[PDB]
Design an enzyme around this catalytic site. Structure first.
Site, PDB file in Angstrom:
ATOM      1  N   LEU A  44      27.803  44.862  38.581  1.00  0.00           N
ATOM      2  CA  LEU A  44      28.459  45.726  40.089  1.00  0.00           C
ATOM      3  C   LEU A  44      29.640  46.510  39.364  1.00  0.00           C
ATOM      4  O   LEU A  44      30.194  46.275  38.408  1.00  0.00           O
ATOM      5  CB  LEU A  44      29.082  44.511  40.671  1.00  0.00           C
ATOM      6  CG  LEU A  44      28.080  43.556  41.243  1.00  0.00           C
ATOM      7  CD1 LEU A  44      28.618  42.544  42.208  1.00  0.00           C
ATOM      8  CD2 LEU A  44      27.216  44.269  42.161  1.00  0.00           C
ATOM      9  N   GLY A  47      35.210  48.649  37.836  1.00  0.00           N
ATOM     10  CA  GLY A  47      36.050  49.382  36.934  1.00  0.00           C
ATOM     11  C   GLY A  47      35.586  49.501  35.395  1.00  0.00           C
ATOM     12  O   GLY A  47      34.730  48.564  35.206  1.00  0.00           O
ATOM     13  N   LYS A  48      36.141  50.197  34.513  1.00  0.00           N
ATOM     14  CA  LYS A  48      35.757  50.739  33.385  1.00  0.00           C
ATOM     15  C   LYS A  48      35.390  49.241  32.387  1.00  0.00           C
ATOM     16  O   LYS A  48      34.281  49.128  31.786  1.00  0.00           O
ATOM     17  CB  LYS A  48      36.471  51.400  32.551  1.00  0.00           C
ATOM     18  CG  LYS A  48      35.897  51.949  31.277  1.00  0.00           C
ATOM     19  CD  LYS A  48      36.577  53.238  30.582  1.00  0.00           C
ATOM     20  CE  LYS A  48      36.241  53.514  29.289  1.00  0.00           C
ATOM     21  NZ  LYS A  48      37.026  54.597  28.719  1.00  0.00           N
ATOM     22  N   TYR A  49      36.266  48.462  32.547  1.00  0.00           N
ATOM     23  CA  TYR A  49      36.469  47.161  31.676  1.00  0.00           C
ATOM     24  C   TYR A  49      35.858  46.030  32.233  1.00  0.00           C
ATOM     25  O   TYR A  49      35.702  44.997  31.578  1.00  0.00           O
ATOM     26  CB  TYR A  49      37.891  47.098  31.043  1.00  0.00           C
ATOM     27  CG  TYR A  49      38.177  48.332  30.156  1.00  0.00           C
ATOM     28  CD1 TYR A  49      37.722  48.822  29.207  1.00  0.00           C
ATOM     29  CD2 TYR A  49      39.359  49.017  30.783  1.00  0.00           C
ATOM     30  CE1 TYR A  49      38.030  50.076  28.455  1.00  0.00           C
ATOM     31  CE2 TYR A  49      39.954  50.046  30.193  1.00  0.00           C
ATOM     32  CZ  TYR A  49      39.082  50.708  29.245  1.00  0.00           C
ATOM     33  OH  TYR A  49      39.675  51.877  28.577  1.00  0.00           O
ATOM     34  N   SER A  50      35.580  45.937  33.419  1.00  0.00           N
ATOM     35  CA  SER A  50      34.936  44.892  34.029  1.00  0.00           C
ATOM     36  C   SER A  50      33.491  44.393  33.908  1.00  0.00           C
ATOM     37  O   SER A  50      32.931  45.132  33.297  1.00  0.00           O
ATOM     38  CB  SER A  50      35.024  44.966  35.779  1.00  0.00           C
ATOM     39  OG  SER A  50      33.860  45.980  36.057  1.00  0.00           O
ATOM     40  N   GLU A  51      33.333  42.975  33.939  1.00  0.00           N
ATOM     41  CA  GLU A  51      32.030  42.442  33.435  1.00  0.00           C
ATOM     42  C   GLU A  51      31.697  41.563  34.770  1.00  0.00           C
ATOM     43  O   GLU A  51      31.867  40.286  34.829  1.00  0.00           O
ATOM     44  CB  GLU A  51      31.983  41.803  32.257  1.00  0.00           C
ATOM     45  CG  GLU A  51      32.511  42.658  31.110  1.00  0.00           C
ATOM     46  CD  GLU A  51      31.232  43.549  30.592  1.00  0.00           C
ATOM     47  OE1 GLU A  51      30.133  43.418  31.398  1.00  0.00           O
ATOM     48  OE2 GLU A  51      31.436  44.671  30.145  1.00  0.00           O
ATOM     49  N   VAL A  52      31.378  42.139  36.006  1.00  0.00           N
ATOM     50  CA  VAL A  52      31.130  41.420  37.259  1.00  0.00           C
ATOM     51  C   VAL A  52      29.721  41.689  37.574  1.00  0.00           C
ATOM     52  O   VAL A  52      29.180  43.007  37.473  1.00  0.00           O
ATOM     53  CB  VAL A  52      32.196  41.962  38.295  1.00  0.00           C
ATOM     54  CG1 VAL A  52      31.832  41.264  39.696  1.00  0.00           C
ATOM     55  CG2 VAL A  52      33.612  41.746  37.656  1.00  0.00           C
ATOM     56  N   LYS A  67      31.688  36.689  37.191  1.00  0.00           N
ATOM     57  CA  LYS A  67      32.615  37.443  36.552  1.00  0.00           C
ATOM     58  C   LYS A  67      32.961  36.968  35.231  1.00  0.00           C
ATOM     59  O   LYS A  67      33.117  35.678  35.024  1.00  0.00           O
ATOM     60  CB  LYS A  67      34.066  37.566  37.359  1.00  0.00           C
ATOM     61  CG  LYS A  67      35.120  38.354  36.310  1.00  0.00           C
ATOM     62  CD  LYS A  67      36.381  38.786  37.456  1.00  0.00           C
ATOM     63  CE  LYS A  67      37.255  37.584  37.780  1.00  0.00           C
ATOM     64  NZ  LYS A  67      38.618  38.009  38.299  1.00  0.00           N
ATOM     65  N   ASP A 155      48.055  41.757  44.182  1.00  0.00           N
ATOM     66  CA  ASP A 155      47.103  42.658  44.048  1.00  0.00           C
ATOM     67  C   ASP A 155      46.306  42.929  45.167  1.00  0.00           C
ATOM     68  O   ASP A 155      44.961  43.518  45.276  1.00  0.00           O
ATOM     69  CB  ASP A 155      46.104  42.654  43.011  1.00  0.00           C
ATOM     70  CG  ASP A 155      45.326  43.860  42.244  1.00  0.00           C
ATOM     71  OD1 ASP A 155      46.038  45.041  42.470  1.00  0.00           O
ATOM     72  OD2 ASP A 155      44.561  43.539  41.376  1.00  0.00           O
TER      73      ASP A 155
END
Ligand SMILES: O=C(O)c1ccc(-c2oc3c(Cl)cc(Cl)cc3c(=O)c2O)cc1
Ligand SMILES: [Cl-]
Ligand SMILES: [Cl-]
Length: 330
Positions: A44, A47-52, A67, A155
């Site tokens: 999904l 954002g660039k660094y996410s792992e979702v 996640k 956030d």
């Protein structure tokens, strides 16, 4: 001397009076589920660094979202887990369905319930006046709940609100910056996302509280009723405060700085200039007029205040007449 201290005006000592293990998240012993219950389907965009990932629970064929976390940040992982567990079952809080890890590598992952989200960039163009009132009320239920449980989200922004619109189903997600409130604690101001940062973060006032989340909520409300997303669009944190001052005015800003004895970075006075407060009515035009009412403007005015102590609490917000028709519906 230094800045004036501040404490929250609601839920001040919730954590003080809990058992230590409620808020002492480094002590938490994680109960791990079974990694082999989940299969990753598709990455999904987070954002660039996410792992979702969209995933499937193969024991019941229900969709979930996984996640994957980076194990290096042990204390931060335990904080997010403990906050998600403390708030599970609360109104409009994303459900943590499981916590799993690779049995050999020990790489851990959080498993969330699935919400059939419509991307806010598309959804907010279609929302009616009633829809905005309804979903604002749903977000307020989540914030009153987590604040009442001693937790600041830190956030709040559209990207962290999942909406399954056809089921009128909202969940507040990404508790990775959330923190327990303890009165007198000096917190990190490098939280939230630029456009949703409250003035306290932008002037480096560290003794903030739950009311930070109410400023972020007011930013979202303004973007929704005025069809201007994001509403305050600075190019950096200093310009972010200039953008707020061009709307709220510089006099109430300098009044806030004076009240808390905040030492303003000296380049600020140059760029802040001198700006009158703009009547909220000024931002109404032909494409947003059907979303704006006197009640909406009165409510927004009471969230977007420089002084964090003067902002509505989430419960006070839920009583505002803007929500009268929503409250009857529920
Ligand atoms: O970091 C987190 O706390 C967190 C929690 C939940 C989600 C999450 O994202 C979704 C996205 Cl991005 C698209 C869609 Cl269509 C569905 C979902 C979803 O069901 C879902 O649970 C993402 C991050
Ligand atoms: Cl912090
Ligand atoms: Cl509150």
């Amino acid at each position: 001397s230094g800045p004036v201290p501040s404490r929250a005006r609601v839920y001040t000592d919730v954590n003080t009076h809990r058992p230590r293990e409620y808020w002492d998240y480094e002590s938490h012993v994680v109960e791990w589920g079974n990694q082999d219950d989940y299969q990753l389907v598709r990455k999904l965009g987070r954002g660039k660094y996410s792992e979702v990932f969209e995933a499937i629970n193969i024991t019941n064929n229900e969709k979930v979202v996984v996640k994957i976390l980076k194990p290096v940040k042990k204390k931060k992982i335990k904080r997010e887990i403990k906050i998600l567990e403390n708030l599970r079952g609360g109104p409009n809080i994303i459900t943590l369905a499981d916590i799993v890890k690779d049995p050999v590598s020990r790489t851990p992952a959080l498993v969330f319930e699935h919400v059939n989200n419509t991307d806010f960039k598309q959804l907010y163009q279609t929302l009616t006046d009633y829809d905005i009132r309804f979903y604002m009320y749903e977000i307020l239920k989540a914030l009153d709940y987590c604040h009442s449980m001693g937790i600041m989200h830190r956030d709040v922004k559209p990207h962290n609100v999942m909406i399954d619109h056809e089921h009128r189903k909202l969940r507040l997600i990404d508790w990775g910056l959330a923190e327990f409130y303890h009165p007198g604690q000096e917190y990190n101001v490098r939280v939230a996302s630029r456009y949703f940062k409250g003035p306290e973060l932008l002037v480096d006032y560290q003794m903030y509280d739950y009311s930070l989340d109410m400023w972020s909520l007011g930013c979202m409300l303004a973007s929704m009723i005025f069809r201007k997303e994001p509403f305050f669009h600075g190019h950096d944190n200093y310009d972010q405060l200039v953008r707020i001052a061009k709307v709220l005015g510089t006099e109430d800003l300098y009044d806030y700085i004076d009240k808390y004895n905040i030492e303003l970075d000296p380049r600020f006075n140059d760029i802040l200039g001198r700006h009158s407060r703009k009547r909220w009515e000024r931002f109404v035009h032909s494409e947003n007029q059907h979303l704006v009412s006197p009640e909406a403007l009165d409510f927004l005015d009471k969230l977007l205040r420089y002084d964090h102590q003067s902002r509505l609490t989430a419960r006070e917000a839920m009583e505002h007449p803007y929500f009268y028709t929503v409250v009857k519906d529920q």
